[PDB]
């Protein structure tokens, strides 16, 4: 049961009580990815970035679509980006609704799950109305957003947001100062060291531990610069101060979704230059030039110049890489993805030696380890 929506088999040699040893076996979900993305073109191979993790959807692909526009020397048009903040910062309300709960289903409670997922539904519509599908939805592209959003959603985002800070106040009176929970987590799995850096951890289990750095305001993304927010920080390096980021980090988002509904300027959506964007269905269907760039654009891909990149983002649980070589022609060469799960679980064996076994179930939950991602 304690698989955390994933599959792992870990083996410990405990000393009579204390664990003092752990050495997990990952590699149950491997599936053979990066050997199969040398064989697909650029726009054809997009989803296999969406299907990597199960929870954050538009926050992936925001980290691929930003690792391609570079090699192309092209930026989206202004109404592109100000979408990618509204969905980009709405799925930080997903992994923070999950990692406070389906973590705390291990601690044994019931309602903080059956109480929330009433709501995590009211969001899944907003993936379905905008484009198609229940979870994995392929929307972002190399050219900015796919197609415009209907007449609506801005009375279904606003009406939904002003209701929400209450539900996050039913996960507080139900958790923070409830003792039997405070005692299940304090001073548990403390890594305060400069090994907590030396391992190269990403965001939280950093920012909740002191050392202070974030990739949203030290680097711009896509206009992220023009909205104001404050990055919560923790006191002592234990778990219950890596929880308390993930409440005060759900009460920052509703600032931005509220700050980002006021600014969205009218404008096109796709990149304009049309060699990298398909045309509409009014244009490809009458004039001439609008096939030969719609009919060579759906067999081979773009032509994206050679030379290597790297890039990074802040995904709800930590960074996300793409190290994208490209050989100078249509199909890629290594596309090497890194997500946490080579750090946040590199550091279990270290972190937990000297506490019981019935802690090690509640240590994992704070890293937010979610697998098939360790397809890294």
């Amino acid at each position: 049961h304690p698989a955390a929506h994933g599959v792992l088999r870990l083996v410990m040699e405990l000393s009579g009580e204390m664990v003092r040893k752990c050495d997990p076996h990952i590699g149950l979900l491997h599936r053979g990815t990066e050997k199969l993305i040398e064989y697909k073109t650029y726009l054809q191979a997009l989803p296999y970035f969406d299907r990597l993790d199960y929870v954050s959807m538009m926050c992936n692909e925001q980290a691929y679509s930003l690792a391609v526009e570079k090699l192309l020397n092209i930026q989206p048009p202004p109404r592109a980006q100000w979408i990618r903040v509204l969905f980009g910062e709405i799925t930080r309300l997903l992994n923070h609704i999950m990692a406070v709960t389906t973590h705390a289903l291990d601690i044994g409670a019931m309602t903080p799950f059956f109480w929330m997922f009433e709501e995590r539904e009211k969001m899944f519509e907003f993936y379905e109305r905008v484009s198609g599908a229940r979870m994995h939805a392929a929307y972002v592209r190399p050219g900015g957003v796919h197609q415009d959003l209907p007449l609506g959603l801005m009375d279904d985002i606003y009406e939904f947001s002003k209701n929400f800070s209450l539900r996050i106040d039913e996960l507080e009176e139900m958790l923070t100062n409830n003792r039997i929970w405070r005692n299940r987590t304090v001073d548990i799995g403390i890594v305060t060291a400069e090994d907590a850096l030396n391992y190269g951890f990403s965001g939280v289990m950093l920012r909740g531990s002191g050392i202070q750095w974030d990739l949203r305001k030290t680097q711009p993304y896509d206009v992220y610069d023009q909205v104001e927010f404050d990055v919560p920080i923790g006191s002592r390096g234990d778990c219950y101060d890596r929880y308390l980021c993930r409440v005060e980090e759900m009460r920052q988002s509703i600032r931005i979704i509220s700050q980002c509904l006021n600014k969205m300027p009218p404008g096109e959506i796709k990149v304009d230059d049309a060699k990298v964007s398909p045309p509409k269905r009014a244009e490809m269907k009458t004039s001439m030039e609008s096939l030969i760039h719609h009919f060579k654009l759906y067999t081979e891909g773009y032509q994206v110049p050679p030379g290597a990149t790297y890039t990074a983002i802040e995904a709800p649980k930590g960074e996300f890489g793409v190290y994208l070589v490209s050989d100078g022609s249509s199909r890629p060469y290594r596309c090497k993805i890194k997500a946490p799960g080579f750090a946040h679980l590199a550091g279990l064996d270290k972190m937990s030696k000297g506490h019981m076994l019935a802690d090690v179930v509640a240590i994992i939950g704070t890293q937010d380890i979610v697998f098939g991602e360790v397809d890294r």
Partner: protein, 90 residues
């Protein structure tokens, strides 16, 4: 009634934000036909490819490779710290 404020005896009171939205205050359908504009240098008589040019940009500029009052130049200036950001920062 006797069950209305016994829902209001706990969790403060709400009666406005309520879980099921099931009642009214929603969006109806897509009634109107929309029209999506095409702005960004879509016109004629001027827009000319080879000024818009998204791609065709050079190879990575080299630096001295095989075959001086340096201040110990760092890659960039060091970071200045953050504020404490009045919100209720404690």
């Amino acid at each position: 009634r006797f069950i209305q404020w016994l829902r209001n005896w706990a969790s403060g009171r709400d009666l406005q934000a309520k879980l099921q939205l099931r009642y009214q205050e929603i969006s109806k359908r897509t009634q109107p036909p929309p029209k999506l504009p095409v702005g960004p240098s879509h016109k004629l008589s001027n827009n000319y490819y080879c000024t818009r040019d998204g791609r065709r940009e050079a190879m990575p500029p080299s630096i001295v490779m095989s075959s001086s009052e340096k201040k110990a130049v760092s890659p960039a200036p060091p970071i200045k710290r953050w504020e404490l950001s009045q919100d209720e920062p404690y």
